[PDB]
Structures are given as C-alpha cells and as structure tokens.
C-alpha cells in the first residue's frame, strides 16, 4: 500500500513533490503515467492516438489500480485517473494527499519552450475530484518543494 | 521539407526506423504527436479529456500541416493522424514512407482478444496508409537497419 | 531450474527475446532488470544516480541468485550480472544462452535511449563499445550457446533457440 | 543586448526564471538549451550523446554569439557555455544575473528527467560535484548581479531580480 498517494493538477507537484517525499520516507517513487506506459511498452500518446479516452482510462484504471494494490512507495496518480469510476472507488481507504495549486502558478510552473484558459476548465472539471477523494490538502502555491515535504510528513 | 516521413501501424517502427534514419542522415526525427504537446504547452490527454477527440485532430492537423513545413529531418506521424482528409491532403508530394508490417507481427513488437483489436485499426488505415504512401516498405522480414538503407538508397 | 538465461550486451535483445521466447514456450518470463525495480520500489536509473553499480550489483546477484532456484520459466539477465563473480558461479549447469551483438547494432538497437545508465549516452557510442569489451569476453565464458543476432529477426531468434534446446 | 542573461548551476533556475521572468518584463525569451534543440532539429540529449561535449559547445557558442546580439529580451544561458572562453568574452558588459544554488538543492530540482547529459547515469551527486567545481567559478568571473534561489521560490527571485534592473 503506498504511503501516500499525491494528486492534484498537472503542475501541482506530484512528481516533484513525489521524488523527495520519496526519498524522506526512504520508499521509491512510482508514477502511473510511468506505469502504463511501462508495462504496456507504448506511450500515452500511443494509446489516446490510437484507441481512444474510453480504452486507455480503461487501461489507466487497471494500473492504478495494480499500482495501489502492490506498490509500496508514493503514488503519483496520472493527473486525469480520478476522472475514471474505477479509480475512485480504488482510492477509498488510502492516504490521499491532494496538493493544491491556483491557476495562474499552475499555469506558470507548466510553462516549456490562452492556454490558461484551458487550464481553468481542468480545474473546474478535476478539482473537485481532488478534494472528493482527498484525505488532505496541502496547498502548494507559496511553499517551496521541502516544505510541501515536511507539511506532508508532519500530518502522515 | 521532410527529408522522409514515416507512417504505419503501432509496430511498424515508425519511431526505430525514424531514429535510425534521422541519425543516419545528419538530421533530426520530429514526431507529431510530441509536436502537439511541444505546441500547446498540454498533454495529449489534456485535449482529449478537456477538449474532445475531435477537436484534436483539428489541433493534430495544424501541427503536421506546420511540421511537414517546418522540419527538414524525418518526420514521424502520429498514426491516428490519418484519417484526417486535411493531413492526407498536406502529405501530398512530401515523401512518405510506408511501413508496412502484419498484424501478428505489429502485434508482437508492443511490449511485456486484442489481434482482431489490431486486425480493425489494420482495416481502418490500412488503406489511408497505402493511399498516401510514395514509398512502400516491408519491416515484416526485413530486419530495421535493413530497412533503414531501402529507404536511403531512394531518398 | 530455469529455461534459459539470456545473456548479451545491451541491446542484444534478451529482454525482446526473452519475452517472445516464453510466450513461445507457454512459460512465464523473469526480467531481472524488472525484478530489481518490482523489488526495491524504484527504478533502474535512480538505483544507479544515487547508490551507483556496486550496491546496485549487489542487489542485482541476489535477485538473481534467487531467480536461478526458483524461476522455472526464462530469465532474461540484466546486462552487467556476470561482472559479478558471484552469478558468474551460480550460472554454471544452467542453459546459458548469449545473444551476440556486433558494436554498431546495439549502439542503434539502443533508442528509446532506453533509460540504460551504463549506456547513459553523456557520449554513447565510446561507452557502449567499452561494455562490449568488459562484457563479451565475460558472456563467452558463462555461455552455453552462442547465437548472432545481427542479420536475425526476432522471430527467427526465437526460433532458433527453440531447436537448440 | 538582453535584459538579463542567467548562469547558474545545472537546476538554479536558468530556464525556469527564464521564462516567468520574460513574462514580467514583457519581453522574449530565448533559452540556448531549446535554440539548439530547434537549430538542428534533434535534443540536447541526443547532441551529446552522438557528437560529443566538445562539440555540443561549437554549436552552443555558436547559438550564444546569435543571442548577445540579436535578442532583447531575457537569455537563459546554457549551463556550460561559459566553459568556452568565446563565449566568457562575448559576455563582457551584458547583465548576467548569476543564479545561485547548493549542491544539494541543485541535485535535487534536477531530479525530475529530461536531458542533463553531463549529469547522466551513474552517482549523479559526484558528477554535479564536478561541474560546480568546474563551472562555478566561471560564474563568478562573467556575473554582474547575483541571486540566491536557495529556500527562496521563484516568483520571489522574479521580483528579487525585477527590483534590481
Ligand atoms: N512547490 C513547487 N515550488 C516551485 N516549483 C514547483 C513546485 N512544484 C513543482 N514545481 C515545478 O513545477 C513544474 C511542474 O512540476 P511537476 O510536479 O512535474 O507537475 P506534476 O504535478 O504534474 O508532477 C516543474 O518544474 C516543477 O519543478
Ligand atoms: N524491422 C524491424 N524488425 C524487428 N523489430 C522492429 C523492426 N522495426 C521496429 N522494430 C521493433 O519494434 C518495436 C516497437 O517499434 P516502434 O519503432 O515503436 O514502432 P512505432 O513507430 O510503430 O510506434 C521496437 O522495439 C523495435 O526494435
Ligand atoms: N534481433 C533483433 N532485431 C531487430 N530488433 C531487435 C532485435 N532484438 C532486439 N531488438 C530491438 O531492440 C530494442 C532493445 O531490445 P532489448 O530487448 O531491450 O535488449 P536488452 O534487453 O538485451 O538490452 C527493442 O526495441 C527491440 O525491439
Ligand atoms: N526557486 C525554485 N523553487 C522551486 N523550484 C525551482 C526553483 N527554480 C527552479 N526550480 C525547478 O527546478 C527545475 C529545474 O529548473 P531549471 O529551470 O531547469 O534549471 P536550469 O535551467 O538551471 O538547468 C524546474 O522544474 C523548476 O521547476
Ligand atoms: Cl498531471
Ligand atoms: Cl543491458
Ligand atoms: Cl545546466
Ligand atoms: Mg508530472
Ligand atoms: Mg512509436
Ligand atoms: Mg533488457
Ligand atoms: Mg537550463
């Protein structure tokens, strides 16, 4: 069972957050959008772009649910899973850890190389799945990565 | 444009071959898809899950129509991206090469009832695939390298 | 008692054959390389980037050593296990079968660059002819059988090693 | 010339500040590391991997040369840049804000993956150890203000530079 299972937007942390948490507890990371594309041998692109939304949630659902059963580490969850039924039933009983990020530093820490406006539609549609499988919020917006850390421990 | 662009199944080796042929011609492999999220800053899933299927070919398209523009290295093109008549039409006159591999095979190359799964997207594209092509190519046999001087020896 | 134990460079395929070769033989297959990530919960790369080959070597012999007694099925063995003497010695009664790979194959066999922190391509080529001449003289040695993979397929591959069993 | 041109060690935020930095100042960005992904049409990675160091630096300094004159806006410098004297001397007189971080934070922000192929594969600790210790004292001599990331996160470094140009 992992010892936390992180979620929230793309750019709320999870992998960041998840490398170091990782690393504090002493457990390894495990991301599912590394998992599937893993133990899959294709890429997510490969999947959308070749069977569709309904087959690969189909396919994100099997993994996580693999992953929550027999990975004991951290958990960073694919950042559109807790769309999938499946995957919030799966999550009832875990230690969800929900990193809240505000959309203009969500939209900021995402970057690379409008926009923005596609990230609040994410949000309004994710967020409250956030919260409703949740089992604690950190708000990540003006803390840095170690201090999400040790925020995180200190309730875990 | 496009020194080459490479299409086919999953498996086919679009992306082997891509690297292969890139590298053993000074140039770069571009993908498509990684183009699109190069593009908007967001995943593919996030376009998908936000923004319909559909409206993401109509994303999947400006990007190749820019990429096939753009990119003077070989190109890879995200399968899917096919049945888009505006993709079909900007291949028009760029090289493209056709990876042609069996389903069972196809299969076999992905990864540790899904053949019919694949005999389907096999059917779907199949025929786009052949209908687009200037270059057909059998990676059934053929071993990658191999096919990797078919190509070069038509650039 | 396993099956087989495929050994060779990276890039030689034992992973590809490895999992043809047991789908072939309806028999499960062991990845050592996936094992050793399934165990200690984190993947290869960072095994390496933060405890490097040594202590990533020694958990690598015991996964294996566990492997060679209670696998049955066929292990693909990760690339650098018979530097370790210790396997190098268990190995022995079991069917080694070795993938052999010329330089400039692997090196292009080795893409997705596929994660590979040996091969960690900081200048690739250089580094992978180097594990091939740490490494070839070590898989002859341990090897029962002895197969180019180079003007091969993967099918064939696997077929092959289907009638030299 | 550009605004601001940042230095730092590999994860002080050259490319991340970069960007949100541009943005406050309404200007350009232009990151050296991604000009040369676009120039040649193929990654940072794979450069390296292929040609080698000294030879991803010919083409850097080539793209580095480029932007000293003909950008205005923000210049996120390639980390290892400064190791080419051309370089060193093409940035005299330009404002080159020196981002400072600790080994143990600079590990640790670069820890994510993508690229880093001086930071590669095996004990990644030793080989930033090196860089910092081959690096950072070039920093030193071409900087002209300095700025600690450190426990500070990088809205604040934005306005710690942004209050000082
Ligand atoms: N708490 C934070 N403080 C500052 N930067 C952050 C913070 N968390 C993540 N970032 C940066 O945000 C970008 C997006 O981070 P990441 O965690 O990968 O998103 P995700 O939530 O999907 O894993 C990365 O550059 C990461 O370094
Ligand atoms: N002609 C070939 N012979 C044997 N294997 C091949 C050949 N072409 C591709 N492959 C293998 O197929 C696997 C999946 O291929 P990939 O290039 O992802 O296909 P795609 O472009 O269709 O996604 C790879 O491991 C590669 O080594
Ligand atoms: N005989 C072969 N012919 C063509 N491609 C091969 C062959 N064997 C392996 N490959 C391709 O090479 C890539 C790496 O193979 P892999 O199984 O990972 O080698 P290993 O596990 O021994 O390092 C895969 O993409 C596989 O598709
Ligand atoms: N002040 C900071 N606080 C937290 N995260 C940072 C900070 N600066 C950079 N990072 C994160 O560090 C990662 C590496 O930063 P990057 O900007 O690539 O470094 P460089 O460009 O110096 O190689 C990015 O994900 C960025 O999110
Ligand atoms: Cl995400
Ligand atoms: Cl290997
Ligand atoms: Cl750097
Ligand atoms: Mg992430
Ligand atoms: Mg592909
Ligand atoms: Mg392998
Ligand atoms: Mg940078």
């Given at each position: 069972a992992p010892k936390a299972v992180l979620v929230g937007?793309?750019?709320?942390?999870?992998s960041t957050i998840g490398r170091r948490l990782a690393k504090a507890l002493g457990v390894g990371l495990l991301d599912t959008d590394v998992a599937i594309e893993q133990r899959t041998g294709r890429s997510i692109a490969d999947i959308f772009a070749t069977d569709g939304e309904q087959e690969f949630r189909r396919i994100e659902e099997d993994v996580v649910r693999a992953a929550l059963a027999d990975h004991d580490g951290v958990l960073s969850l694919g950042?559109?899973?807790?769309?999938s039924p499946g995957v919030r039933a799966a999550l009832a009983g875990h230690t969800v850890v929900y990193l809240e990020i505000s959309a203009a530093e969500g939209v900021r820490r995402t970057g690379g190389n409008d926009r923005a406006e596609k990230y609040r539609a994410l949000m309004a549609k994710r967020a409250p799945l956030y919260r409703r499988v949740a089992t604690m919020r950190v708000d990540?917006?003006?803390?840095n990565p170690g201090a999400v850390v040790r925020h995180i421990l200190s309730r875990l």
């Open positions: 937007l793309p750019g709320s942390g999870k950042g559109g899973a807790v769309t990540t917006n003006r803390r």
